[PDB]
Amino acid sequence: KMQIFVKPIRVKTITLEVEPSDTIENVKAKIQDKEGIPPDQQRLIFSGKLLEDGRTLSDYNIQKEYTLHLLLRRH
């Protein structure tokens, strides 16, 4: 018996065009457009926080080229 690894070959990174005034809700809506994930399946994470839908990217000091973390419900 031995051990091997398996990774997806598809690029998992999502690229978005946003404004600092966009809310986390709007960002989740844009993620759905590209990947087709319903908003209530996503939670966005950044700087060690669960980003709340009602706040803006500006509220979290999210600048250009930053990367957000995507949490999904497991089925």
Positions in the binding site for another protein (CB under 8 A): 43, 45-50, 61, 63, 65-67, 69, 71, 73-74
What is the closest distance, in whole angstroms, from the C-beta atom of residue 24 to another protein in the complex?
13
What is the closest distance, in whole angstroms, from the C-beta atom of residue 63 to another protein in the complex?
7
Closest CA to 14 of 71, 74, 75, 70: 70
What is the closest distance, in whole angstroms, from the C-beta atom of residue 19 to another protein in the complex?
18
Closer by beta carbon to another protein, 14 or else 45: 45
Closer by beta carbon to another protein, 15 or else 67: 67
**Spatial separation of the C-alpha atoms in residues 59 and 72, rounded to whole Å:** 22
Residues in contact with 44: Cβ distance below 8 Å, sequence separation at least 6, in sequence order:
24, 27, 28, 50, 51, 68, 69, 70, 71
